[PDB]
C-alpha cells in the first residue's frame, strides 16, 4: 500500500466488499437479501485523478494507478495610467470576493491589478518613477498577490524591467518493498513513483512616454482609440447570432461624437 497514489488499495477493497449484495439467513427458514451501500467505495474513488485499474488475480487484487498531469498558464496584463508630471495616480482593476475571517463572517478584499505611480520628469527625456505595483490573482479561497514597489529611472520612450521571479521545482518521491522493487524487469510492480516539475516566470516591465505637445496626446489617443474601434467593428462583422448586428455597441469614428442608430436615422430623415 502506498500514500503517493490517489487512493490506497485498502479503502478500495473495503469499499468493493461493502458494495456487494449481502444476504442474512435465519434457519430453523428465513433468508433475506439486501444490497450494500457504495458510500465507502464512493469515498475511495472521489480522490482518484488518473487511471486506477484493479486487476484481480487469485484473490490478490493488484491496483495499478498512473497519471500525467500537464498544466500551463500564460498571462499578460499591462495597465497604463496617464498622469500629470509630479502628480500621483492610482489605478485599480479588481473584483472583490467574499472573505470569512471567523454562520461565518465575510470580509471583502480586492484582488486585481493596481498601479500607483508618482512620476517626475527630468527636464528632458528620462522620467523618474516612484511605483507601487500589485497584482491580484485568486483561485476558504486562496489567491496569489505579487507586488513590487520600487523607484526606477526610465528613459523617455524605452522599456525597463522593474522586477521578476524565475522559479523551478522538481519533487521526486518513491516507495518500494525495497528488495523486490530493485529488480529491473519486475521492479515496477512493487514501486510507487510520484514525480513533479513546476516552473514559473514573472517579469514586470514599465514604459513611460512623455506627452508635451497636444499633437502627441492626440497621436497616442488616436491609436488606442482606433484599436478598440477596430475590435468592435470586427465584432459587428460577425455579430450577435440571434440579434440584429446593429445592436452591438461600436465607437463612432474618431472625433465624430454621437450617431443615431441606422433605423432611427432613417426615421429622422422622413419626418
Amino acid at each position: 500500500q502506498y500514500g503517493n497514489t490517489g487512493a490506497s488499495i485498502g479503502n478500495v477493497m473495503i469499499g468493493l466488499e461493502e458494495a456487494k449484495d449481502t444476504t442474512q439467513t435465519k434457519a430453523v427458514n428465513e433468508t433475506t437479501t439486501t444490497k450494500g451501500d457504495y458510500t465507502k467505495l464512493a469515498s475511495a474513488l472521489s480522490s482518484i485523478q488518473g487511471a486506477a485499474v484493479s486487476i484481480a488475480m487469485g484473490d490478490w487484487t493488484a491496483l495499478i494507478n498512473a497519471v500525467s498531469n500537464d498544466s500551463s498558464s500564460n498571462i499578460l496584463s499591462s495597465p497604463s495610467i496617464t498622469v500629470m508630471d509630479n502628480g500621483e495616480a492610482s489605478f485599480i482593476v479588481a473584483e472583490e470576493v467574499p472573505v470569512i475571517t471567523g454562520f461565518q463572517t465575510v470580509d471583502r478584499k480586492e484582488v486585481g491589478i493596481k498601479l500607483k505611480v508618482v512620476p517626475q520628469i527630468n527636464e528632458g527625456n528620462s522620467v523618474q518613477l516612484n511605483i507601487e505595483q500589485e497584482v491580484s490573482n485568486v483561485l476558504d479561497v486562496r489567491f496569489a498577490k505579487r507586488q513590487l514597489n520600487t523607484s526606477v529611472m526610465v528613459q523617455d520612450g524605452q522599456m525597463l524591467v522593474l522586477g521578476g521571479l524565475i522559479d523551478e521545482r522538481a519533487l521526486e518521491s518513491e516507495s518500494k518493498v525495497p528488495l523486490l522493487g530493485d529488480i529491473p524487469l519486475l521492479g515496477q510492480l512493487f514501486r510507487s513513483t510520484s514525480s513533479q516539475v513546476e516552473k514559473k516566470n514573472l517579469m514586470v516591465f514599465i514604459k513611460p512616454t512623455i506627452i508635451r505637445d497636444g499633437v502627441t496626446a492626440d497621436g497616442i489617443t488616436q491609436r488606442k482609440y482606433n484599436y478598440i474601434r477596430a475590435e468592435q467593428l470586427f465584432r459587428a462583422e460577425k455579430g450577435l447570432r440571434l440579434l440584429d448586428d446593429a445592436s452591438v455597441p461600436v465607437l463612432p469614428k474618431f472625433g465624430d461624437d454621437r450617431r443615431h442608430s441606422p433605423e432611427i436615422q432613417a426615421f429622422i430623415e422622413q419626418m
Partner: protein, 82 residues
Amino acid sequence: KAEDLVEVLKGVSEVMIAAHADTNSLVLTAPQDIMNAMLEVIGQLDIRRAQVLIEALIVEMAEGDGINLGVQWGSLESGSVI
C-alpha cells in the same frame, strides 16, 4: 525633490527657501553671494542617481531516504504477540 532640497538648504541659507511641489521647482530669495552659493549646492545635489538591479538566487535541495522493515508475530487463541 524640492521638499528634500528645501529642508537641506535651510541650514546653508543660515534668505527664504520655498519648495513648489507641483512644478518640482524651488524658489530662492537671498542676496547675490548667498544665491551663488546655494546654486552651487543645488547644482551638486541635483545629480543623477544610478540604479541597481538586485538579483537574488535561492537554492534549496532536499533529499530523504528511509528503510523500515521488520517481522511481527502473533497468536490470538492464547494472545501472544511479538
